């Protein structure tokens, strides 16, 4: 393994592979913020498909 | 608050009310009350 | 390597393990829509095709 | 017939370049 | 050079120019305005020569480089039309104690059109003028 | 040996020589987009951006620099039609010349990795063995891409420091680059105002930068590190192309319905327009506002801009094309000359007919002319024997208004058809089929193409998809399975499939 | 022309066809 | 610096059933291909 | 220009046979 | 289009130049 200046200083974020949080660690608040991306795109799905119609603006060339 | 976002909404709460929810808890439920035994 | 190379050209045993793709095939759809008996699914592969293509011409 | 004028490269070539990778591939094995 | 890479040249020309102004001046002031046409001869002379050696009063009648087909080319015949400009001369500044004049000019003169090898465009020069004036 | 379709997996544990690989494609990439500018430079024809815009001549990657603001060439001319702006380097010729170097750099660099692969860096400190934490790797490169989504938003498309972004009218009239503020209502989810993505790039740059910053700093749970394979780069590769084949769907679809990012004017008019007859509604709205001033039919229609009426023209939608019509769009029709004008065709009793106009989904269609209450009065038939609604017969009329047949009328019936059948495709237009010797079949525009290939590869990446998902999940079984299993797979014989601490010995 | 490229791609597989039959790789028992 | 030998360098191999295999696939697809090439 | 119409193809395989055989044989060198 | 032949022929030289000279056979004492 040949050293170089760059490596050297890049070192240490390459330096913790493999490292772990025991057990479920932030997996429920993954979930929140997943539920909440699907929503998000379930909303600007329906925007766009025209099965869901807001006020102020029409989805459409003109605005 | 358009009648079509009011709908959108319903269909959130109701989906999660009239499946997930009542799945998930069935679910635990069976799987709590039915456990393997090693 | 490619997996091909496992096996050799007039080899006495058997190349893949038909007990497992029954398991898994029977926990698929369910133990009895599965063939266990390779003579009887080898038969069944040649008369499907077979028999419709007789129907059609 | 007025044919696409680039016709006859494009099959050329489309044929021709898969064909020399599958002889280089194939002369080359044992090395 | 216009916009787009097309290169345009032009006999840029006041040639025989005749201008006139209105009627009833009796001093050449800031008010004065020649107005006039003036001749535009052809950009290419008649002992011009194209690159295949085809020329008006010299050179090829005839694509020599296609013995074929060398009467096929409507460039074989070469001419050289004398065209027209018009120039307008605005006066601006006098000096009076020297008999000086300047202004502005704005002229309108056809192109090349490389011994008729191309309708010629329009061309537009402004610019500005100076000129003495004997007593 | 490698199978033939396994040759790149040498590089699978080797950081160095997957970093080459890595910068040889960007290389490639960019070389192909400077390229691919250059040959479009080469051959575009900036003389009329009325009737030949550059979708009517299969531009690719001039509609994307022009987007983004590269609307000028150092040849003086602009995309918009302006001539006399000077943009300093960053013309097209300017954006063309950066790629190829930036990919000759990138070509160096990857020689450089390619050579010198074994670097420290790529190795782990405790052991000895070559060692990515990709983890780490995907916090940097998070926080790395939110902070150019934020910036990009907030620099670029806002113009703080940055030409903006394509804007236009919505009949794609007046298209012109422009600084565009971010829309933060419920607006900015219209897929058709600049401002939602102008927001979007300055919200979701800043959720990257937290996201980023999140990942930078907490270690994946045990749970989720061992389901997902976190010490398989292939799990990377997996989900990498699954992010990637729904961003190509995203952009598919956005380009093939029409989106504020996929203007008219750079990639030419979307099928939906011709469908609802778009254009034609406006340009009717028009010639009545005229008419209700007081001006006449002539006056009225000649207050249509030539662009508005081309837009009009089926020929111009790209689901008229075909698979192997090539090229660009003025192979085909030709290239446009000028509007003939509006025809008006009235029978001899003077009702006004109307040509009924041809579907996306018709190569060819019946020639129908219905008066205002939708009856058919005139027809070009098929069979003469029984015929009783010919041209002929009803002594149809068409006289036109505008254009370059403004104040003629037709009444000899072969003209009478060519331009009743030229009213089937729209408004009609004047065509020079000398300079690319067209062929007269449509092709469709950069739209179309860009729709059709975005889709494909979508699907074809859904497989990728799959196929290194299966590679990642069961790499324990790729040579295939293990010599037992004779106990394992059999039913009844455990409680829980596959759990060897679960038999129910009965 | 267009005549020989068809003629040639045809001609290719056919002369595929022969060499794959003629000049396999022989079936050997190991 | 040095320019050490990598050691993930593996030989590639193509049978000659598979050239034949590929090559008929070549030529089958020329022949599909050509008369839409040439339109 | 009115070029040869077959100029295209002709150097295309001039450069490339040439070029294939060439690299059919580097390849394969040391089998 | 023949500008593009031309440029091609004379890219594949000058890149037969660059590999020729980077990747060369190492001359080595024996
Ligand atoms: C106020 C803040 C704000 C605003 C105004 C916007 C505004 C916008 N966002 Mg952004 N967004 C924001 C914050 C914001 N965003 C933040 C904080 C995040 C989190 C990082 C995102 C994440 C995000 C994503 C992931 C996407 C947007 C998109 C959009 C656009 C929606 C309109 C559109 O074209 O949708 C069109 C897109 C959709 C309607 C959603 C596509 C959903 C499809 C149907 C799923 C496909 C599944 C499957 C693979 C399809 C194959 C099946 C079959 C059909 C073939 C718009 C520009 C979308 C976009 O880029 O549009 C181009 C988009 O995809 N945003
Ligand atoms: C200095 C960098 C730089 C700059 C300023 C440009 C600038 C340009 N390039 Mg070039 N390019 C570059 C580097 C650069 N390039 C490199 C390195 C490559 C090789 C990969 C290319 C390859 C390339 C091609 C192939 C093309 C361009 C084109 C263009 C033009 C249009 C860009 C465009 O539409 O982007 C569009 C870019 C995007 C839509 C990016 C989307 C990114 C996705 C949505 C994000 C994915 C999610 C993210 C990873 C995670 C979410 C994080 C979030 C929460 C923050 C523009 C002149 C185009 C052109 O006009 O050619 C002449 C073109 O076709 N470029
Ligand atoms: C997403 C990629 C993409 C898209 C959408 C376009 C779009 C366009 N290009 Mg560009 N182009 C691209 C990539 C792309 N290009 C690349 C990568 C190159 C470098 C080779 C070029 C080089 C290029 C040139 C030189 C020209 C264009 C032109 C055009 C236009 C006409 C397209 C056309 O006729 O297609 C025709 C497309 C097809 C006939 C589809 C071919 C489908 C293949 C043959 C199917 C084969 C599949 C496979 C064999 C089957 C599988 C077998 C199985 C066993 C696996 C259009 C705007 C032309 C133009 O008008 O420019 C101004 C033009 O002259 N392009
Ligand atoms: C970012 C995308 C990406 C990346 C990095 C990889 C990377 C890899 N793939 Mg995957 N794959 C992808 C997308 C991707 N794939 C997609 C979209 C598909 C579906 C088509 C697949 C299907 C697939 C299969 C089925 C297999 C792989 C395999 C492999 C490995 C070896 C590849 C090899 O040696 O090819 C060598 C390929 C050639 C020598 C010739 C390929 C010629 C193709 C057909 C035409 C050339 C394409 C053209 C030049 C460039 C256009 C690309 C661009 C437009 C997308 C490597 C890890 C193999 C593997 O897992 O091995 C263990 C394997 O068996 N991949
Ligand atoms: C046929 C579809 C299909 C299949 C079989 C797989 C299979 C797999 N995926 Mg993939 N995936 C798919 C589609 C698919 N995916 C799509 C469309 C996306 C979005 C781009 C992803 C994104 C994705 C990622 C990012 C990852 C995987 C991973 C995996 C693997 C682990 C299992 C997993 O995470 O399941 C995925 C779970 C599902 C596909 C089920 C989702 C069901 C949704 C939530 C229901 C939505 C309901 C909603 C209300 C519908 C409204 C729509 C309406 C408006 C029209 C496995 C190989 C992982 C992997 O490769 O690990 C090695 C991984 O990291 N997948
Ligand atoms: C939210 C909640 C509550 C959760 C939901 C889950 C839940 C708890 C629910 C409880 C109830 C429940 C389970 C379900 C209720 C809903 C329900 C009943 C759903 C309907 C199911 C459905 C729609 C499916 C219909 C489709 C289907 C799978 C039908 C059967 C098709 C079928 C029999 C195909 C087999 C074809 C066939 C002839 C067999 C052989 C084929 C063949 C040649 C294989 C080759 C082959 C075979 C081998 O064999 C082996 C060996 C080898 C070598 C081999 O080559
Ligand atoms: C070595 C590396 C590469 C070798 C090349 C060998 C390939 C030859 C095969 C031919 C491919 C395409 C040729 C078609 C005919 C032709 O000559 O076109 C010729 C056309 C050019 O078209 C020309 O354009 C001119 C304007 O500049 C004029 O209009 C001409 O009339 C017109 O013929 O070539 C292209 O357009 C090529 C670009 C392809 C665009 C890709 C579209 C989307 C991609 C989808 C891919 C689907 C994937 C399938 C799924 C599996
Ligand atoms: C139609 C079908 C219906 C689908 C749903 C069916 C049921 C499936 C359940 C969903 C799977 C949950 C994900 C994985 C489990 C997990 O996170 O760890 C479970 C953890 C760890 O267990 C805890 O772990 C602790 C230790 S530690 O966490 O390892 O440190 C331990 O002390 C404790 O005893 C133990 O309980 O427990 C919890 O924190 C309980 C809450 C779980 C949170 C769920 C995640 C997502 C919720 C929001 C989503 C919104 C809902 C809408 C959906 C669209
Ligand atoms: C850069 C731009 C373009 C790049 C050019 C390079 C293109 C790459 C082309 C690769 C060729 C792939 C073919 C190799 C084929 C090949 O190597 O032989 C089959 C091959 C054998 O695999 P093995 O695992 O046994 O590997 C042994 C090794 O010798 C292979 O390297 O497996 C596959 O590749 C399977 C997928 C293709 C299977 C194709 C079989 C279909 C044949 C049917 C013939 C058609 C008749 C139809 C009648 C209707
Ligand atoms: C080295 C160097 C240099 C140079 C550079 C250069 C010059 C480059 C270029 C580059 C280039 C110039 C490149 C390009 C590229 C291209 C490409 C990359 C392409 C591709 C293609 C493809 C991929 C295609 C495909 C296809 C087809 C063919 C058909 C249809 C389908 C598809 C699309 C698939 C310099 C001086 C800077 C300096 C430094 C060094
Ligand atoms: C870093 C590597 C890249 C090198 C740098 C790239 C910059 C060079 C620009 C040329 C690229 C092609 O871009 C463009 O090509 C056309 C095609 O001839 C040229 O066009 C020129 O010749 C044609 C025909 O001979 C004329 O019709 C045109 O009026 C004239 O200007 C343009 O002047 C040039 O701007
Ligand atoms: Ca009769």
Same mark, same amino acid.
């Given at each position: 393994? !040949?050293?170089?200046?760059?490596?050297?200083?890049?070192?240490?974020?390459?330096?913790?592979?493999?490292?772990?949080?025991?057990?479920?660690?932030?997996?429920?608040?993954?979930?929140?913020?997943?539920?909440?991306?699907?929503?998000?795109?379930?909303?600007?799905? !329906?925007?766009?498909?025209?099965?869901?119609?807001?006020?102020?603006?029409?989805?459409?060339?003109?605005? | 608050?358009?009648?079509?976002?009011?709908?959108?909404?319903?269909?959130?709460?109701?989906?999660?009310?009239?499946?997930?929810?009542?799945?998930?808890?069935?679910?635990?439920?069976?799987?709590?009350?039915?456990?393997?035994?090693? | 390597?490619?997996?091909?190379?496992?096996?050799?050209?007039?080899?006495?045993?058997?190349?893949?393990?038909?007990?497992?793709?029954?398991?898994?095939?029977?926990?698929?759809?369910?133990?009895?829509?599965?063939?266990?008996?390779?003579?009887?699914?080898?038969?069944?592969?040649?008369?499907?095709?077979?028999?419709?293509?007789?129907?059609?011409? | 017939?007025?044919?696409?004028?680039?016709?006859?490269?494009?099959?050329?070539?489309?044929?021709?370049?898969?064909?020399?990778?599958?002889?280089?591939?194939?002369?080359?094995?044992?090395? | 050079?216009?916009?787009?890479?097309?290169?345009?040249?032009?006999?840029?020309?006041?040639?025989?120019?005749?201008?006139?102004?209105?009627?009833?001046?009796?001093?050449?002031?800031?008010?004065?305005?020649?107005?006039?046409?003036?001749?535009?001869?052809?950009?290419?002379?008649?002992?011009?020569?194209?690159?295949?050696?085809?020329?008006? /009063?010299?050179? /090829?009648?005839?694509?020599?480089?296609?013995?074929?087909?060398?009467?096929?080319?409507?460039?074989?015949?070469?001419?050289?039309?004398?065209?027209?400009?018009?120039?307008?001369?605005?006066?601006?500044?006098?000096?009076?104690?020297?008999?000086?004049?300047?202004?502005?000019?704005?002229?309108?003169?056809?192109?090349?059109?490389?011994?008729?090898?191309?309708?010629?465009?329009?061309?537009?020069?402004?610019?500005?003028? /100076?000129?003495?004036?004997?007593? | 040996?490698?199978?033939?379709?396994?040759?790149?997996?040498?590089?699978?544990?080797?950081?160095?020589?997957?970093?080459?690989?890595?910068?040889? #494609?960007?290389?490639?990439?960019?070389?192909?987009?400077?390229?691919?500018?250059?040959?479009?430079?080469?051959?575009?024809?900036?003389?009329?951006?009325?009737?030949?815009? =550059?979708?009517?001549?299969?531009? *690719?990657?001039?509609?994307?620099?022009?987007?983004?603001?590269?609307?000028?060439?150092?040849?003086?001319?602009?995309?918009?039609?302006?001539?006399?702006?000077?943009? $300093?380097?960053?013309?097209?010729?300017?954006?063309?010349?950066?790629?190829? +170097?930036?990919?000759?750099?990138?070509?160096?660099?990857?020689?450089?990795?390619?050579?010198?692969?074994?670097?420290?860096? *790529?190795?782990?400190?405790?052991?000895?063995?070559?060692?990515?934490?990709?983890?780490?790797?995907?916090?940097?490169?998070?926080?790395?891409?939110?902070?150019?989504?934020?910036?990009?938003?907030?620099?670029?498309?806002?113009?703080?420091? $940055?030409?903006?972004?394509?804007?236009?009218?919505?009949?794609?009239? %007046?298209?012109?680059?422009?600084?565009? &503020?971010?829309?933060?209502?419920? &607006?900015?989810?219209?897929?058709?105002?600049?401002?939602?993505?102008?927001?979007?790039?300055?919200?979701?740059? @800043?959720?990257? @930068?937290?996201?980023?910053?999140?990942?930078?700093?907490?270690?994946?749970?045990?749970?989720?590190?061992?389901?997902?394979?976190?010490?398989?780069?292939?799990?990377?590769?997996?989900?990498?192309?699954?992010?990637?084949?729904?961003?190509?769907?995203?952009?598919?679809?956005?380009?093939?319905?029409?989106?504020? %990012?996929?203007?008219?004017?750079?990639?030419?008019?979307?099928?939906?327009?011709?469908?609802? $007859?778009?254009?034609?509604?406006? @340009?009717?709205?028009? +010639?009545?506002?005229?008419?209700?001033?007081?001006?006449?039919?002539?006056?009225?229609?000649?207050?249509?801009?030539?662009?508005? &009426?081309?837009?009009?023209?089926?020929?111009?939608?790209?689901?008229?094309?075909?698979?192997?019509?090539?090229?660009? =769009?003025?192979?085909?029709?030709?290239?446009?000359?000028?509007? @003939?004008?509006?025809?008006?065709?009235?029978?001899?009793?003077?009702?006004?007919?109307?040509?009924?106009? =041809?579907?996306?989904?018709?190569? %060819?269609?019946? +020639?129908? =002319? %219905?008066?205002?209450? $939708?009856?058919?009065?005139?027809?070009?038939?098929?069979?003469?024997?029984?015929?009783? *609604?010919?041209?002929?017969?009803?002594?149809?009329?068409?006289?036109?208004?505008?254009?370059?047949?403004?104040?003629?009328?037709?009444?000899?019936?072969?003209?009478?058809?060519?331009?009743?059948?030229?009213?089937?495709?729209?408004?009609?237009?004047?065509?020079?089929?000398?300079?690319?010797?067209?062929?007269?079949?449509?092709?469709?525009?950069?739209?179309?193409?860009?729709?059709?290939?975005?889709?494909?590869?979508?699907?074809?990446?859904?497989?990728?998809?799959?196929? #290194?998902?299966?590679?990642?999940?069961?790499?324990?079984?790729?040579?295939?399975?293990?010599?037992?299993?004779?106990?394992?797979?059999?039913?009844? +014989?455990? &409680?829980?499939?596959?759990?060897?601490?679960?038999?129910?010995?009965? | 022309?267009?005549?020989?490229?068809?003629?040639?791609?045809?001609?290719?597989?056919?002369?595929?066809?022969?060499?794959?039959?003629?000049?396999?790789?022989?079936?050997?028992?190991? | 610096?040095?320019?050490?030998?990598?050691?993930?360098?593996?030989?590639?191999?193509?049978?000659?059933?598979?050239?034949?295999?590929?090559?008929?696939?070549?030529?089958?697809?020329?022949?599909?291909?050509?008369?839409?090439?040439?339109?």
């Amino acid at each position: 393994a !040949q050293r170089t200046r760059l490596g050297d200083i890049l070192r240490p974020l390459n330096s913790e592979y493999g490292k772990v949080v025991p057990g479920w660690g932030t997996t429920p608040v993954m979930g929140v913020f997943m539920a909440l991306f699907l929503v998000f795109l379930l909303i600007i799905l !329906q925007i766009y498909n025209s099965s869901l119609i807001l006020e102020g603006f029409s989805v459409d060339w003109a605005g | 608050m358009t009648p079509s976002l009011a709908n959108f909404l319903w269909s959130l709460v109701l989906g999660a009310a009239i499946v997930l929810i009542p799945a998930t808890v069935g679910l635990i439920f069976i799987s709590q009350k039915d456990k393997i035994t090693r | 390597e490619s997996q091909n190379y496992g096996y050799k050209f007039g080899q006495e045993e058997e190349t893949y393990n038909i007990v497992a793709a029954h398991g898994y095939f029977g926990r698929l759809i369910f133990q009895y829509a599965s063939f266990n008996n390779s003579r009887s699914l080898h038969f069944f592969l040649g008369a499907w095709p077979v028999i419709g293509i007789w129907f059609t011409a | 017939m007025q044919v696409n004028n680039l016709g006859f490269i494009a099959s050329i070539l489309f044929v021709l370049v898969p064909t020399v990778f599958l002889l280089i591939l194939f002369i080359q094995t044992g090395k | 050079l216009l916009p787009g890479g097309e290169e345009v040249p032009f006999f840029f020309t006041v040639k025989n120019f005749t201008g006139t102004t209105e009627p009833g001046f009796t001093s050449i002031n800031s008010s004065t305005d020649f107005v006039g046409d003036f001749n535009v001869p052809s950009y290419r002379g008649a002992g011009f020569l194209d690159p295949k050696a085809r020329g008006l /009063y010299t050179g /090829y009648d005839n694509a020599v480089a296609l013995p074929s087909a060398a009467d096929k080319f409507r460039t074989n015949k070469k001419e050289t039309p004398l065209g027209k400009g018009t120039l307008s001369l605005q006066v601006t500044q006098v000096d009076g104690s020297t008999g000086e004049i300047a202004g502005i000019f704005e002229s309108e003169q056809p192109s090349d059109t490389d011994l008729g090898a191309k309708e010629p465009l329009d061309v537009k020069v402004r610019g500005i003028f /100076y000129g003495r004036v004997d007593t | 040996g490698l199978p033939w379709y396994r040759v790149h997996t040498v590089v699978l544990n080797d950081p160095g020589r997957l970093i080459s690989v890595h910068l040889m #494609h960007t290389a490639l990439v960019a070389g192909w987009a400077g390229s691919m500018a250059l040959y479009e430079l080469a051959i575009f024809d900036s003389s009329d951006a009325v009737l030949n815009p =550059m979708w009517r001549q299969g531009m *690719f990657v001039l509609p994307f620099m022009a987007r983004l603001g590269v609307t000028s060439s150092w040849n003086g001319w602009s995309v918009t039609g302006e001539t006399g702006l000077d943009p $300093g380097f960053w013309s097209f010729e300017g954006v063309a010349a950066a790629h190829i +170097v930036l990919s000759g750099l990138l070509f160096l660099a990857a020689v450089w990795h390619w050579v010198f692969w074994d670097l420290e860096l *790529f190795v782990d400190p405790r052991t000895g063995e070559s060692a990515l934490d990709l983890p780490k790797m995907f916090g940097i490169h998070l926080f790395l891409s939110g902070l150019l989504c934020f910036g990009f938003g907030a620099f670029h498309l806002t113009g703080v420091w $940055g030409p903006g972004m394509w804007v236009s009218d919505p009949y794609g009239l %007046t298209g012109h680059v422009q600084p565009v &503020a971010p829309e933060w209502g419920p &607006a900015g989810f219209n897929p058709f105002n600049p401002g939602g993505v102008v927001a979007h790039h300055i919200a979701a740059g @800043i959720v990257g @930068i937290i996201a980023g910053l999140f990942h930078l700093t907490v270690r994946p749970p045990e749970r989720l590190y061992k389901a997902l394979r976190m010490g398989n780069i292939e799990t990377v590769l997996s989900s990498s192309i699954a992010a990637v084949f729904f961003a190509a769907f995203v952009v598919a679809g956005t380009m093939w319905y029409g989106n504020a %990012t996929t203007p008219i004017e750079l990639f030419g008019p979307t099928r939906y327009q011709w469908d609802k $007859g778009y254009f034609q509604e406006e @340009i009717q709205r028009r +010639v009545d506002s005229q008419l209700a001033e007081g001006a006449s039919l002539s006056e009225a229609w000649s207050t249509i801009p030539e662009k508005l &009426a081309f837009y009009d023209y089926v020929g111009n939608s790209p689901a008229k094309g075909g698979l192997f019509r090539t090229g660009a =769009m003025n192979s085909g029709d030709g290239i446009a000359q000028e509007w @003939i004008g509006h025809p008006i065709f009235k029978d001899k009793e003077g009702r006004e007919l109307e040509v009924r106009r =041809m579907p996306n989904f018709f190569e %060819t269609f019946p +020639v129908i =002319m %219905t008066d205002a209450d $939708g009856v058919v009065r005139a027809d070009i038939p098929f069979r003469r024997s029984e015929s009783k *609604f010919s041209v002929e017969q009803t002594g149809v009329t068409v006289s036109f208004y505008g254009g370059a047949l403004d104040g003629q009328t037709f009444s000899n019936p072969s003209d009478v058809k060519k331009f009743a059948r030229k009213a089937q495709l729209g408004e009609g237009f004047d065509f020079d089929t000398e300079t690319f010797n067209s062929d007269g079949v449509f092709r469709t525009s950069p739209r179309g193409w860009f729709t059709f290939g975005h889709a494909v590869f979508a699907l074809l990446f859904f497989f990728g998809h799959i196929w #290194h998902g299966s590679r990642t999940l069961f790499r324990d079984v790729f040579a295939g399975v293990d010599p037992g299993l004779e106990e394992q797979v059999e039913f009844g +014989v455990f &409680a829980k499939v596959g759990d060897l601490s679960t038999r129910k010995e009965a | 022309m267009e005549s020989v490229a068809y003629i040639l791609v045809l001609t290719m597989a056919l002369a595929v066809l022969f060499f794959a039959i003629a000049f396999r790789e022989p079936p050997r028992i190991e | 610096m040095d320019r050490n030998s990598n050691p993930n360098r593996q030989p590639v191999e193509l049978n000659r059933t598979s050239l034949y295999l590929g090559l008929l696939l070549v030529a089958v697809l020329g022949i599909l291909f050509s008369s839409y090439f040439f339109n």
